[PDB]
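Quarterly update, task 2.4: flavin-adenine dinucleotide-bound model.
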Amino acid sequence: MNHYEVLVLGGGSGGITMAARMKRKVGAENVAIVEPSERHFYQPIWTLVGAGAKQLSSSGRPTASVIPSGVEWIKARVTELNPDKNCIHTDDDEKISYRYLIIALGIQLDYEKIKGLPEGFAHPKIGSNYSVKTVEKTWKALQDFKEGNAIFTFPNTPVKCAGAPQKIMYLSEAYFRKTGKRSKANIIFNTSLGAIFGVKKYADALQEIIQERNLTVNYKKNLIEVRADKQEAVFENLDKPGETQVISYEMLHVTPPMSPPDVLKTSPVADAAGWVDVDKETLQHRRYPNVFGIGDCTNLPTSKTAAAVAAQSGILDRTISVIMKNQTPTKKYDGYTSCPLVTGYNRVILAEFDYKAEPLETFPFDQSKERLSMYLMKADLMPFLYWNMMLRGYWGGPAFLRKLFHLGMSLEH
Ligand SMILES: Cc1cc2nc3c(=O)[nH]c(=O)nc-3n(C[C@H](O)[C@H](O)[C@H](O)COP(=O)(O)OP(=O)(O)OC[C@H]3O[C@@H](n4cnc5c(N)ncnc54)[C@H](O)[C@@H]3O)c2cc1C
């Protein structure tokens, strides 16, 4: 019966970040991470990997190289959560108790919920930037595109980084004009939602881009079946239930339906929908006071992005400490998240907003414009910030920079 003071489930973005932070509060010997995967990935890179601008190798590092020093990695898989006995079970038939539990198991990918997938990925002309086993196929399909439909999908489930399914689309259309095939290309975005983005300031910006480059996007249209050998795709019309259409594709990028992790779906910590039932502001579990959640696995009503994980860590950091002093949490999480919408091989519309779906930009200029500066930040600066700052516990969002940037524009204006 092993036991730790701070037990963190998941060794991904939120898990490694919280373990680094908790390594400073209690001892590094008082912290443990449960995670089966041997590679750790900065998944925001996979957008440009499938676009052909970066290598997949540079998006991953050995999990052992991102474990905070002195913290014991438990290379295993979480099997059961028993918060009424302050205990969890792992797939190595082990039972480890905690004093506080931090749940950071991310989101789950459900390619199987589409009929032809994952079987159809063995065939050419299809890929997905969301799985490491398929993001490289997206770039290959992009090069070997010669003539036909370029179709990009968005599922009928909650997703992580809701902008990614269209980023690859704009980069693909940009690649077609660059290589002389836009005249031979028919770009289509069949999304399950009824708007191109959740905040109008950037949805207006994307709408101008869609109309300028002659892109077709069909709202309330969900992919349900892939026929990879025949190069066909089946879409359900969510606005007219029962109405389906079969469309032949030359390149298909599917965004898989997603769900809470399987172990969390029925677990006693779960929402009615399967997400970790935390509080909007403290990120502390609503029923079990010694349980906390962060990232895609929880029911925080904001976009499940890595930027949100950074902002949540600083809030969660203070929440656990004020709890460890038996006081009451005061600092609230504003719902901050960012979605670096890559519109081309040198442009990014960096969207930033809060719980109220209202803009909250870090920089003094207008970020709803395609800007090269923001592309350089996302492409070259942020990967450095992720490995060396965030995962070390020295990054919790740009809030302290939004302050001085808007204090600097006080001297000016
Ligand atoms: C293609 C793509 C592009 C993206 N681009 C951006 C972007 O530009 N900006 C942005 O902010 N975000 C972006 N994101 C989102 C970002 O990658 C995630 O939101 C972020 O990693 C969330 O961190 P997390 O720890 O909650 O999830 P993860 O980093 O995925 O952590 C989950 C971890 O839990 C582990 N785990 C799963 N099940 C179990 C289990 N049963 N037991 C134990 N461990 C388990 C997994 O192995 C994994 O290591 C993108 C995502 C994708 C897929």
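Highlight for this quarter: The longest strand covers residues 94-103.
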